[PDB]
Amino acid sequence: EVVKFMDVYQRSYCHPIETLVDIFQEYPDEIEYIFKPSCVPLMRCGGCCNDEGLECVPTEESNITMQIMRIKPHQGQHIGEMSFLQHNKCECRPK
Amino acid sequence: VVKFMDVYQRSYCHPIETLVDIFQEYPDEIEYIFKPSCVPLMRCGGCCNDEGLECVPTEESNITMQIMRIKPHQGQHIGEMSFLQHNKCECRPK
């Protein structure tokens, strides 16, 4: 079908969306592990603002805890809990 | 706490809603302001079972969305613009 103008604009406006984030980037100091999965689904600010001078940034944040399998090759393999940053509220602010 | 199996299943390579910048998809449309300037498209994302593999589209389709175009000082109107979606993803080597 055709997505109507007002529908597209509401659905694309600045708000938290599920975003797949690479576990190694959120933890650059864990160089020695393989993670499974290697990325996690987190709420992060996405979408656009009403003009090019604004950007979508978080104004409220929380943490969520997920079970991630760590493997260090030849040594061991186990699951455990890791914490990740989420965005709960977003605002359009100047850059 | 999110359990291992659920995190793994939700994070594995599949089409996920993704906010795509309209000018990036239409770099010829140079003089316009677009409203909204991005659209939500199903695009591949997520991870693969090991670092040698990357997530990539295998089946694609188009979606038509009404987008407002503004050339500042000249005019303003809406019309239809077509965008590429991903329907199926596969993990393949890099």
Epitope: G76, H78, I79 | -
Partner: antibody, heavy 123, light 108 residues
Framework: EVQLVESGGGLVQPGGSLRLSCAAS????????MNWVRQAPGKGLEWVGW????????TYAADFKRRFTFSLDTSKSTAYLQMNSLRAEDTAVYYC????????????????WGQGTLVTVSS | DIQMTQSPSSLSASVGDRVTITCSAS??????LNWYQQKPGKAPKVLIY???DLHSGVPSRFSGSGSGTDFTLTISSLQPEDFATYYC?????????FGQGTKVEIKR
């Protein structure tokens, strides 16, 4: 409750072979590596190696590589240790022991053990 | 293979005495050292991991210290049920290796 129950110990002739089995219960077998450890009568502890229960990949201490084989049956949540060319010095209680839940960093200690199963190399 | 030497090999102490057991590594292992207690006829039981982290469920009278190549397991007040063989274990490099054991008898 998390329990490891081994079985398969018994008499085996010098130069023979047998399979030991370590049935897990009370947790997800695929989420923690399984270690094998043996103790000869009156003696110390000896790490044989371990196996990745999610992928199936084994890792052997060197002295054990030629005669000891690891394998899995994830549907029955069981780890196997197969041994051949056996000798008197392999008479021992053989343990399986699972790796732990981690909290901060990864620490490779042995969390829960089986009761052990005794292999006696004799005619 | 890293060689873990424990001393003494056995010791005898009264109820209430402070008991200390040392582990020596053939090369630096950082703090990658665990301690186990093995009672007659049972599988070993982890007491401490990562040099000094008391495993949950283990009396606080067990504690560990050290680093590099020298490690100590301490029993601040020896109890009749601490009769056991105590082993150290490094996990700095595979294969994992154990010290030879320390037998703790109770004097009465």
């Amino acid at each position: 409750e998390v329990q490891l129950v081994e079985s398969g110990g018994g008499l085996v002739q010098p130069g023979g072979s047998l399979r030991l089995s370590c049935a897990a219960s009370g947790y997800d077998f695929d989420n923690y590596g399984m270690n094998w450890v043996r103790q000869a009568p009156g003696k110390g502890l000896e790490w044989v190696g371990w196996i990745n229960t999610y992928t199936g990949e084994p890792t052997y201490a060197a002295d054990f590589k030629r005669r000891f084989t690891f394998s899995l049956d994830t549907s029955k949540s069981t780890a196997y240790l197969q041994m051949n060319s056996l000798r008197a010095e392999d008479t021992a209680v053989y343990y399986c022991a699972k790796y732990p839940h981690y909290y901060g960093s990864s620490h490779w200690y042995f969390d829960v053990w089986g009761q052990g199963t005794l292999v006696t190399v004799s005619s | 293979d890293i060689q873990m030497t424990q001393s003494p090999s056995s010791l005898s102490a009264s109820v209430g005495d402070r008991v200390t057991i040392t582990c020596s590594a053939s090369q630096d292992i950082s703090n990658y050292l665990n301690w186990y207690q093995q009672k007659p006829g049972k599988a070993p039981k982890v007491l401490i991991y990562f040099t000094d982290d008391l495993h949950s469920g283990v009396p606080s009278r067990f504690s560990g210290s050290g680093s590099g190549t020298d490690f100590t397991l301490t029993i601040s007040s020896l109890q009749p049920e601490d009769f056991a063989t105590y082993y150290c274990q490094q996990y700095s490099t595979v294969p994992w290796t154990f010290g030879q054991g320390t037998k703790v008898e109770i004097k009465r």
